[PDB]
Design a protein around this ligand. Structure first.
Ligand SMILES: [Mg+2]
Length: 184
């Protein structure tokens, strides 16, 4: 009943240690929320976009660590807003394996520093809301240590943001999110 997409920040500001943390987080979530009728898809972004595995692909090889291990960091700039628009139109596309009727959940993993993107969040969130995409945000690095980045996470997250924003090293986030997914 659920199509859960990951939008992971692979921009150069993301330190290698943190990008690995992202991959570890993604893998654990997929292994945890592994519910028979739950598919996953992942797109990495910088100024470029890489769909690592579509829902159809996951459906063909539902092995998280197999799908995640090969992922290499793109580096470059941080076009988070464009990434969100592309996720909504591309990952949640039936030709990519996305299912009609299914709940749409997007997990954005970033340090909260959008940079270079011609789009602002104001240009993309209304569309995500209209297509029913529930948004969780996982902050890495110094995301929670600046006024700007904290608010960026809040802007991307569905409301109330406090219930949808988590720190990547809060290992208890996954079960909290899992608990919340029973209340979609
Ligand atoms: Mg960046």
């Amino acid at each position: 009943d659920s199509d859960i997409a990951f939008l992971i920040d692979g921009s150069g500001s993301i330190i290698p240690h943190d990008f690995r943390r992202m991959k570890e987080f993604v893998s654990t979530v997929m292994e945890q929320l592994k519910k028979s009728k739950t598919l996953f898809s992942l797109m990495q972004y910088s100024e470029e976009f890489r769909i690592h595995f579509t829902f159809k692909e996951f459906q063909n090889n539902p092995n998280p660590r197999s799908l995640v291990k090969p992922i290499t960091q793109l580096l470059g700039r941080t076009h988070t807003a464009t990434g969100i628009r592309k996720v909504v139109r591309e990952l949640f596309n039936i030709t990519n394996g996305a299912r009609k009727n299914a709940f749409k959940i997007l997990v954005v993993i970033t340090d909260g520093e959008k940079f270079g993107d011609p789009l602002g969040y104001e240009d993309v969130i209304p569309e995500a809301d209209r297509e029913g995409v529930i948004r969780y945000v996982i902050g890495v690095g110094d995301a929670f240590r600046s006024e700007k980045s904290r608010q960026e996470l809040n802007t991307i997250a569905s409301k109330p943001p406090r219930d949808h924003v988590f720190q990547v090293n809060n290992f208890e986030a996954l079960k909290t999110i899992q608990n919340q997914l029973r209340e979609k």
